[PDB]
Amino acid sequence: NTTGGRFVDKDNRKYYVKDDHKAIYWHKIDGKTYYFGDIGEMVVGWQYLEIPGTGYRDNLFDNQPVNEIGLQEKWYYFGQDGALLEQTDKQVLEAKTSENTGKVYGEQYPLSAEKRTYYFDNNYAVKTGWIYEDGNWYYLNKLGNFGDDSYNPLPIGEVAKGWTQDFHVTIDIDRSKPAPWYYLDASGKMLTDWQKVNGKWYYFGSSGSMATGWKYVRGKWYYLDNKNGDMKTGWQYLGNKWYYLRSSGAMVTGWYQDGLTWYYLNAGNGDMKTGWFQVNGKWYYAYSSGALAVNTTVDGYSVNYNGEWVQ
Ligand SMILES: CN1[C@@H]2CC[C@H]1C[C@@H](OC(=O)[C@H](CO)c1ccccc1)C2
Ligand SMILES: CN1[C@@H]2CC[C@H]1C[C@@H](OC(=O)[C@H](CO)c1ccccc1)C2
Ligand SMILES: C[N+](C)(C)CCO
Ligand SMILES: C[N+](C)(C)CCO
Ligand SMILES: C[N+](C)(C)CCO
Ligand SMILES: C[N+](C)(C)CCO
Ligand SMILES: C[N+](C)(C)CCO
Known part of the structure; x- marks a missing residue:
């Protein structure tokens, strides 16, 4: 539920800009879901982030206040186009290692030669x-x-x-x-x-x-x-x-x-x-x-x- 903007490619990174501002953290846009970190860079692949949905890390732009909030962190998977994999059952994916997590669009990193079956909860987070x-x-x-x-x-x-x-x-x-x-x-x-x-x-x-x-x-x-x-x-x-x-x-x-x-x-x-x-x-x-x-x-x-x- 974030409209009025558009994705932008600049300096080897991807952002979502609306009324001249950069999106940050979680955003639901035209049927999909994206996360732009603290300064706006769109993420891809394996990410360990604060759970979305509360509003405190959702629908925010860098020109708005970011409140203190204690939210648990969990694992999520995003496609190479930045779209969050909204799996609620299970999926076979590249194994997350010490070299393919926390990357952003435009960054260079290897794709695991090993894949594993990962289980997900009903909120798209990796299940434990x-x-x-x-x-x-x-x-x-x-x-x-x-x-x-x-x-x-x-x-x-x-x-x-x-x-x-x-x-x-x-x-x-x-x-x-x-x-x-x-x-x-x-x-x-x-x-x-x-x-x-x-x-x-x-x-x-x-x-x-x-x-x-x-x-x-x-x-x-x-x-x-x-x-x-x-x-x-x-x-x-x-x-x-x-x-x-x-x-x-x-x-x-x-x-x-x-x-x-x-x-x-x-x-x-x-x-x-x-x-x-x-x-x-x-x-x-x-x-x-x-x-x-x-x-x-x-x-x-x-x-x-x-x-x-x-x-
Ligand atoms: C092989 N098991 C034995 C020791 C390693 C595991 C844990 C088992 O259960 C325990 O409570 C043991 C007791 O030493 C334990 C080891 C280390 C931390 C906590 C508990 C016993
Ligand atoms: C509780 N009973 C089961 C497990 C131990 C006992 C007897 C049987 O198990 C055994 O007999 C095993 C076989 O390897 C055993 C191990 C060591 C000494 C004696 C027996 C079933
Ligand atoms: C002897 N016990 C194991 C059987 C029972 C508790 O007194
Ligand atoms: C000698 N008893 C009393 C001890 C054991 C069974 O024969
Ligand atoms: C059994 N008795 C006769 C043996 C001893 C006292 O308890
Ligand atoms: C430990 N004891 C006193 C019980 C038994 C001899 O083997
Ligand atoms: C293994 N469990 C699911 C069966 C039981 C206790 O957690």
């Missing part, structure tokens, strides 16, 4: 976050790379691979909200259920998020590292209590013999018993190591070879 494609989930980076007073927005919108945290983010990471870990394979597909990664087992369930701590899966209990997620095995001291996990990771309950020694893991909680305890009417004593006492005396009471108390 989770997406569901052909039976699988994919994660499109929400953030670029940080580096001590440094930030590179290039990775944004790209398909994430490997271990990835899904932070809540607008202009910055919302550190108050949760940021679960996920794992996307070589083609970007999100993994589910049990998975062995870098020599260790992890559980991503049905939602994909990496489990931590105790987890009940298909009738058994597993303990995934509270912080790292990796599945534990063997003896583990958790919450001031001992537990024995099979090599499969599953928690053991009942009587267990380690070498020659017998231990009793609580039927309900699975925690190792110490002191005198009773099993199915019978009485037994386990030392502080959890080790069952056999054929000997304990503070006056005798126990046979099965550790059973005998009157």
Whole structure:
């Protein structure tokens, strides 16, 4: 909705001039959309810009005041004629690199020999976050790379691979909200259920998020590292209590013999018993190591070879 002007070629740049003024930022002109930066030069190709539509960066000319405004920046694609690609689904385009972004009409730059499928939101911006494609989930980076007073927005919108945290983010990471870990394979597909990664087992369930701590899966209990997620095995001291996990990771309950020694893991909680305890009417004593006492005396009471108390 900007009329009364005309495009102008001058000094190897292109502008839109009306009543002798230069257009700047966003403008809707005769069915298409263009962006002319801060001083009027029409942009082309990949651009990381403040979202249009609010009016604060729209329909403006260099002879008008430009207000302070905090608008998020996102990725957009413009044709070589300056027209914004108003895609709302997806399109295969030249990959955005460190040498084909932020260019203006008349500037010289290479065209990526590599192309990628880019997804877009309903407002023509490159889409970020989770997406569901052909039976699988994919994660499109929400953030670029940080580096001590440094930030590179290039990775944004790209398909994430490997271990990835899904932070809540607008202009910055919302550190108050949760940021679960996920794992996307070589083609970007999100993994589910049990998975062995870098020599260790992890559980991503049905939602994909990496489990931590105790987890009940298909009738058994597993303990995934509270912080790292990796599945534990063997003896583990958790919450001031001992537990024995099979090599499969599953928690053991009942009587267990380690070498020659017998231990009793609580039927309900699975925690190792110490002191005198009773099993199915019978009485037994386990030392502080959890080790069952056999054929000997304990503070006056005798126990046979099965550790059973005998009157
Ligand atoms: C392979 N994963 C482990 C370490 C790298 C990723 C992240 C996983 O989840 C985490 O919480 C780890 C714990 O060290 C982590 C590493 C670095 C920053 C934040 C979290 C564990
Ligand atoms: C939770 N269960 C699944 C993943 C671990 C356990 C047992 C099965 O997985 C395995 O048996 C794998 C096979 O490589 C395994 C890895 C390391 C030691 C033992 C078994 C299914
Ligand atoms: C992978 N998700 C879409 C499925 C679930 C949590 O974000
Ligand atoms: C033993 N737990 C994993 C089973 C239950 C919480 O006390
Ligand atoms: C079971 N008792 C007879 C053995 C010991 C006291 O708790
Ligand atoms: C750790 N312990 C006391 C539990 C068991 C011996 O392997
Ligand atoms: C000897 N028991 C009581 C310890 C274990 C099952 O045979």
